[PDB]
mmCIF file of N, CA and C in Angstrom:
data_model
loop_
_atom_site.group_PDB
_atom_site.id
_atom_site.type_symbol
_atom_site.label_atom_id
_atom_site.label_comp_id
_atom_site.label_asym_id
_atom_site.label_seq_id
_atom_site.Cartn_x
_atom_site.Cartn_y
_atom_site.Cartn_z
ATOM 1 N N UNK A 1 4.564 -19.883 -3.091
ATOM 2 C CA UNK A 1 4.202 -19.284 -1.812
ATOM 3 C C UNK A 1 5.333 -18.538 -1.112
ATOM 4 N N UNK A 2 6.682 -19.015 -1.075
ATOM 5 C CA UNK A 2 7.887 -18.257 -0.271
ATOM 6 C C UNK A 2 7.887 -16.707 -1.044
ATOM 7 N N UNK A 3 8.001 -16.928 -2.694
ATOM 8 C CA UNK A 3 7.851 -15.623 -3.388
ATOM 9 C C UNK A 3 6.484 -14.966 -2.876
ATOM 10 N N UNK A 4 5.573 -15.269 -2.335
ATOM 11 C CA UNK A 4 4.499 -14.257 -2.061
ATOM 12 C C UNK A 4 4.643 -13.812 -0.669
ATOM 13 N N UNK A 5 4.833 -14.782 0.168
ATOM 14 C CA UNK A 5 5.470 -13.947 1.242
ATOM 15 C C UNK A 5 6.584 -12.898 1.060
ATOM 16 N N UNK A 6 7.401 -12.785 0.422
ATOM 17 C CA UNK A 6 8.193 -12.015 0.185
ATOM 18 C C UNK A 6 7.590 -10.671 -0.519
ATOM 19 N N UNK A 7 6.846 -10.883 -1.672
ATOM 20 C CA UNK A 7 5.665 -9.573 -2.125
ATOM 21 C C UNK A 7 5.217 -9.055 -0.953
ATOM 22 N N UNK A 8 4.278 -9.840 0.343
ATOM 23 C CA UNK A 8 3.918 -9.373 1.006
ATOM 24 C C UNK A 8 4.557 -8.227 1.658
ATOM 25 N N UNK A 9 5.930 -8.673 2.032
ATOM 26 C CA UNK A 9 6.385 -8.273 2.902
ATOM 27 C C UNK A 9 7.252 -6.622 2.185
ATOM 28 N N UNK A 10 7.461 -7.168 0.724
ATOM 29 C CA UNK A 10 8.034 -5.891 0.485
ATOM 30 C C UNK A 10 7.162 -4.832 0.192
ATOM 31 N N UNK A 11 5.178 -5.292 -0.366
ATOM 32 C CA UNK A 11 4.098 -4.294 -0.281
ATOM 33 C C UNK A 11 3.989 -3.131 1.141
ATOM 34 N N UNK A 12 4.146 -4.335 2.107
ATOM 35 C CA UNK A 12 3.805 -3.778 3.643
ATOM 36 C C UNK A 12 4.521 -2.841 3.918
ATOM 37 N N UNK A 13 6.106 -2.830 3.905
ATOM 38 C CA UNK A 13 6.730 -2.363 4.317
ATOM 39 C C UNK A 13 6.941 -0.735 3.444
ATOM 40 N N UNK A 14 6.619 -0.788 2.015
ATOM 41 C CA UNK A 14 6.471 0.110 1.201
ATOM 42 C C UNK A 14 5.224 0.903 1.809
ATOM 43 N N UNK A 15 4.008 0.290 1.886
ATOM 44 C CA UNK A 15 2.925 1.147 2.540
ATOM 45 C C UNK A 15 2.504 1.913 3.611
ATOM 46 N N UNK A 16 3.418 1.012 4.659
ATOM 47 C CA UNK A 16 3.851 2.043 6.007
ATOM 48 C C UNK A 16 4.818 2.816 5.352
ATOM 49 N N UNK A 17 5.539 3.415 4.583
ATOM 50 C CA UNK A 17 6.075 4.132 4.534
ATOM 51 C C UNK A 17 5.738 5.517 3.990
ATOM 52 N N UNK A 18 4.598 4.876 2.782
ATOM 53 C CA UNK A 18 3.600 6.102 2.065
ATOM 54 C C UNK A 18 2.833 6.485 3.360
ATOM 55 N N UNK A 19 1.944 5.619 3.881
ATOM 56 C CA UNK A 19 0.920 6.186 5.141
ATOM 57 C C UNK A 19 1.863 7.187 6.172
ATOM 58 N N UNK A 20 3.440 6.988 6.548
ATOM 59 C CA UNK A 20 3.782 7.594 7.539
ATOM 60 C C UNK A 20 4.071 8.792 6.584
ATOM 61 N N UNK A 21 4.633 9.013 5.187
ATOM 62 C CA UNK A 21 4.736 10.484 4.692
ATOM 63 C C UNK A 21 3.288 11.058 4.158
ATOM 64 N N UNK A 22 2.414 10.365 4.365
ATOM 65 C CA UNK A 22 0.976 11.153 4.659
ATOM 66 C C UNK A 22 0.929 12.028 5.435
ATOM 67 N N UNK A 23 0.610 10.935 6.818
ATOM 68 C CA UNK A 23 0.937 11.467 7.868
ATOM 69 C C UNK A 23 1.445 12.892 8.324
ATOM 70 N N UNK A 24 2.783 13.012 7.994
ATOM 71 C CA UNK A 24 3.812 14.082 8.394
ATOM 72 C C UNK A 24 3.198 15.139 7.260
ATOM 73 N N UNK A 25 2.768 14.835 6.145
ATOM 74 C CA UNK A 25 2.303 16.017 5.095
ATOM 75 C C UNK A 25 0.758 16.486 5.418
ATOM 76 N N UNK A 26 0.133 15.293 6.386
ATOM 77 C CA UNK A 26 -1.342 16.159 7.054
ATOM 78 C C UNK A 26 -1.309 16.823 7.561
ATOM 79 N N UNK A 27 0.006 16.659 8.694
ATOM 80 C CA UNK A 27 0.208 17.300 10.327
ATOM 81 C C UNK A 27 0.767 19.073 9.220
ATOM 82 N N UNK A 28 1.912 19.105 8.661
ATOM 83 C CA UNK A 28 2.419 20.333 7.697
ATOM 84 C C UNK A 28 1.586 20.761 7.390
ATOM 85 N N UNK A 29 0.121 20.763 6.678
ATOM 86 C CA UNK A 29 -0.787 21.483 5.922
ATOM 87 C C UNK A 29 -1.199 21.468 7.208
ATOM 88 N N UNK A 30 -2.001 21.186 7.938
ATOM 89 C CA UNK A 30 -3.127 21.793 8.757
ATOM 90 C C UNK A 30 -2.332 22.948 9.915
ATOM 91 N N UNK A 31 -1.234 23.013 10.125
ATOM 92 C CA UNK A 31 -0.116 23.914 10.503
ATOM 93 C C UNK A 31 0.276 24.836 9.388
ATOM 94 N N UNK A 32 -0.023 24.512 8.195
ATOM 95 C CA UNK A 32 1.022 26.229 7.498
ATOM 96 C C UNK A 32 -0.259 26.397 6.856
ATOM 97 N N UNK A 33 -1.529 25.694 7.083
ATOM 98 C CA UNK A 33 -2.560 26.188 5.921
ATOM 99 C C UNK A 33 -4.063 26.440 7.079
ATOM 100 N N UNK A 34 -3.611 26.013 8.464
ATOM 101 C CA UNK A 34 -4.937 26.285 9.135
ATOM 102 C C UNK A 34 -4.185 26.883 10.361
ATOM 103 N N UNK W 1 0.336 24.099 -2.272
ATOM 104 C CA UNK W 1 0.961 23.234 -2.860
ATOM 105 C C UNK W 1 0.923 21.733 -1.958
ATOM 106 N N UNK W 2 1.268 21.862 -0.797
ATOM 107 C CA UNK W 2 0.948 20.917 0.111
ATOM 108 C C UNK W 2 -0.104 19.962 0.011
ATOM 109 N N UNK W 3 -1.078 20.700 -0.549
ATOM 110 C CA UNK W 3 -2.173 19.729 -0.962
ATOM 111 C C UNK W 3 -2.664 19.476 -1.810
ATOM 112 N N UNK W 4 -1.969 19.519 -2.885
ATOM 113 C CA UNK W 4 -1.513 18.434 -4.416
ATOM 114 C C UNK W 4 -0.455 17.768 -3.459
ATOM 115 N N UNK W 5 0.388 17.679 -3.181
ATOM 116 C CA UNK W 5 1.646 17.094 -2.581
ATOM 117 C C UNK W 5 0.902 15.875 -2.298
ATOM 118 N N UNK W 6 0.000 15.903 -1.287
ATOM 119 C CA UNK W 6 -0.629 15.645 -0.247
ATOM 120 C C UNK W 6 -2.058 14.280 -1.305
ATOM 121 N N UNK W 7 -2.035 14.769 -2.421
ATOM 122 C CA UNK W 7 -3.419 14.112 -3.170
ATOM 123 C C UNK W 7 -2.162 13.067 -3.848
ATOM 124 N N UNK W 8 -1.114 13.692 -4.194
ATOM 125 C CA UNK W 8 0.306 12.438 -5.193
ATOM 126 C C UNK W 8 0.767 11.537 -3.719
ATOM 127 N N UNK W 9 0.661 11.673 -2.820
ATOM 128 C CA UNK W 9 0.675 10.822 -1.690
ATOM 129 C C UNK W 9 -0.666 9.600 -1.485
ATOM 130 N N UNK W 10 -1.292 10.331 -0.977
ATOM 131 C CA UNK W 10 -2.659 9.232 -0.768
ATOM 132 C C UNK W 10 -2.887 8.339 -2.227
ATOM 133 N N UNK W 11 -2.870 8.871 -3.370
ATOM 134 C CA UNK W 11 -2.647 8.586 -4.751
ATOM 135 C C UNK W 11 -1.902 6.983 -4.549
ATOM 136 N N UNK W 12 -0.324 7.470 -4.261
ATOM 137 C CA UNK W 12 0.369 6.767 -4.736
ATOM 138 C C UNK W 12 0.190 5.129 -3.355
ATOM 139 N N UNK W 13 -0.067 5.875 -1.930
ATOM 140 C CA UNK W 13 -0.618 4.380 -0.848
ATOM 141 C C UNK W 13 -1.689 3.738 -1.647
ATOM 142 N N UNK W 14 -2.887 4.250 -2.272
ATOM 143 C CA UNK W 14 -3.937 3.506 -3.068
ATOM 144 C C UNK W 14 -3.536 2.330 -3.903
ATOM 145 N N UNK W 15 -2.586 3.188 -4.807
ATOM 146 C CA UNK W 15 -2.014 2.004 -5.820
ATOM 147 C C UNK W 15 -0.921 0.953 -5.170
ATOM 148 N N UNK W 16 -0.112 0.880 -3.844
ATOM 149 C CA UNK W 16 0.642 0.392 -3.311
ATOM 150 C C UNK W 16 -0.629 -0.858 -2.624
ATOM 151 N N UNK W 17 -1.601 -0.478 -2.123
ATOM 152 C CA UNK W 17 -2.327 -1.371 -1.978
ATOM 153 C C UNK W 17 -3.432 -1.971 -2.554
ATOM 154 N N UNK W 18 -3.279 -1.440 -3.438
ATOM 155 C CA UNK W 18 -4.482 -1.810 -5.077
ATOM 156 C C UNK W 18 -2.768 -3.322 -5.330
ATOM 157 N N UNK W 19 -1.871 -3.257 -5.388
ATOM 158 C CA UNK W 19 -0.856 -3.897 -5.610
ATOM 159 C C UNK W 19 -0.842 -5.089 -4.773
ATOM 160 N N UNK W 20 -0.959 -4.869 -3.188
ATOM 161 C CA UNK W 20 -1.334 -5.782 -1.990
ATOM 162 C C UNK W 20 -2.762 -6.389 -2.187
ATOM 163 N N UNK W 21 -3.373 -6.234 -2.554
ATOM 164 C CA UNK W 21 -4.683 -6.346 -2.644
ATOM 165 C C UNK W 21 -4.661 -8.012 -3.889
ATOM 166 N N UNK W 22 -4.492 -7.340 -4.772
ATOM 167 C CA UNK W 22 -4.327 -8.484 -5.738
ATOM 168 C C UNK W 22 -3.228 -9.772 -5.777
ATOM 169 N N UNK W 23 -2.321 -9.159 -5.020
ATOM 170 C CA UNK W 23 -1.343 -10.535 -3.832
ATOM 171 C C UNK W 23 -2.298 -10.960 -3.316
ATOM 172 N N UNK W 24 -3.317 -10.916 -2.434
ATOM 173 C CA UNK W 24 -4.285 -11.795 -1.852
ATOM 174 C C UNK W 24 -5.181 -12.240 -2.964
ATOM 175 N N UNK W 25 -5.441 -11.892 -3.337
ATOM 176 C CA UNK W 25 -6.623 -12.231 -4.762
ATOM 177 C C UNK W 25 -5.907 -13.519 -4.696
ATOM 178 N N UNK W 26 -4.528 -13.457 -5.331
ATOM 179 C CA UNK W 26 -3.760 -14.612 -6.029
ATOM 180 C C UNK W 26 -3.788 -15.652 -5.133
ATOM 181 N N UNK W 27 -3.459 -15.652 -3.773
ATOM 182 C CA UNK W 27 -3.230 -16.691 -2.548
ATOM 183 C C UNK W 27 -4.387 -17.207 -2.710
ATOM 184 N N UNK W 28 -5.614 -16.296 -2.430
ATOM 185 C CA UNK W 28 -7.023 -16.838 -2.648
ATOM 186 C C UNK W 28 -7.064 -17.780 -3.528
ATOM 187 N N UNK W 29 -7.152 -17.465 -4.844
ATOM 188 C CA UNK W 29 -7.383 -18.641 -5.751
ATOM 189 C C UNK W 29 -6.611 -19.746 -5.554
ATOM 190 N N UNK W 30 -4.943 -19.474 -5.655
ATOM 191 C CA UNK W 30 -4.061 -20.727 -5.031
ATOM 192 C C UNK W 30 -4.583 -21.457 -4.678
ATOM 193 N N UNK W 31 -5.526 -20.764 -3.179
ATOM 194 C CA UNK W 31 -5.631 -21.684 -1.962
ATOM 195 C C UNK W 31 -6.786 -22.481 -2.367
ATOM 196 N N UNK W 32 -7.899 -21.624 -2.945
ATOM 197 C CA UNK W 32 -8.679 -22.853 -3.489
ATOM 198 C C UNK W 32 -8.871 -23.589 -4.432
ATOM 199 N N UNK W 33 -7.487 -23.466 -5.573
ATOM 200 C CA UNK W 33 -7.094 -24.846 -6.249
ATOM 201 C C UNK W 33 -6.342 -26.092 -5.489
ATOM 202 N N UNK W 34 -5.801 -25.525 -4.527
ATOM 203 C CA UNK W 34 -5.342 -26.699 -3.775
ATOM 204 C C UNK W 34 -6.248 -27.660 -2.850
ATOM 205 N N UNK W 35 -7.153 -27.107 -2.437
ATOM 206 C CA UNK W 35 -8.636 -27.519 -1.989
ATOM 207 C C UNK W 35 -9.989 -28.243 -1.950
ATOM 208 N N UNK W 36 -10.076 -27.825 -3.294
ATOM 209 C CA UNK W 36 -10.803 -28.241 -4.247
ATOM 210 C C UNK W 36 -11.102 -29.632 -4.975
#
């Protein structure tokens, strides 16, 4: 269980990071493409 | 280009939580061998 908290925590923190360079690459296209 | 960029992004959060996803799977079962 301590090792899965730790997965958790290193999934989470990896995934806010993809969702926030989403993010910034939605806001770029709908600005250089609309 | 932005949006291929943009499809290898959403792509790659899917599989980051296709990854999270099956961490809970696992707790799940854990939890209900300990239970049980």
């Amino acid at each position: 269980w301590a090792s899965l908290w730790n997965w958790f925590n290193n999934y989470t923190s990896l995934i806010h990071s993809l969702i926030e360079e989403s993010q910034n690459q939605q806001e770029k296209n709908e600005q250089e493409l609309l | 280009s932005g949006i291929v960029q943009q499809q290898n992004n959403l792509l790659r959060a899917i599989e980051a939580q296709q990854h999270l996803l099956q961490l809970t799977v696992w707790g799940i079962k854990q939890l209900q061998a300990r239970i049980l």
